[PDB]
DNA sequence: GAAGCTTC
DNA sequence: GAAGCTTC
């Protein structure tokens, strides 16, 4: 996720 | 190193 | 199935 906690997506 | 997910 | 980057 995020970053942090990529995206989604990318 | 180890956890934090939908979108093509 | 690849398609992704960091907090910690």
Which are the residues after which chain A is interrupted (C to N > 2.5 Å)?
Answer: 5
Residues near chain C strand, CB within 7 A: A 1-4, 6-10
Kindly state the tokens that stand for A6: 């990529």
Kindly state the tokens that stand for A7: 């995206």
Kindly state the tokens that stand for A2: 């995020």
User: Solved how?
Assistant: X-ray
Q: In whole angstroms, what is the distance from residue A8 CA to residue A5 CA?
A: 10
Q: What is the resolution of this structure in A?
A: 3.0
A7: CB partners within 8 A, 6+ apart: A1
**A3 closest-nt by C1' vs CA:** C6
Q: How many Å apart are A5 CA and C2 C1'?
A: 21
Q: In whole angstroms, what is the distance from residue A9 CA to residue A3 CA?
A: 11
């Amino acid at each position: 996720t995020x970053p942090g906690v990529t995206x989604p997506g990318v």
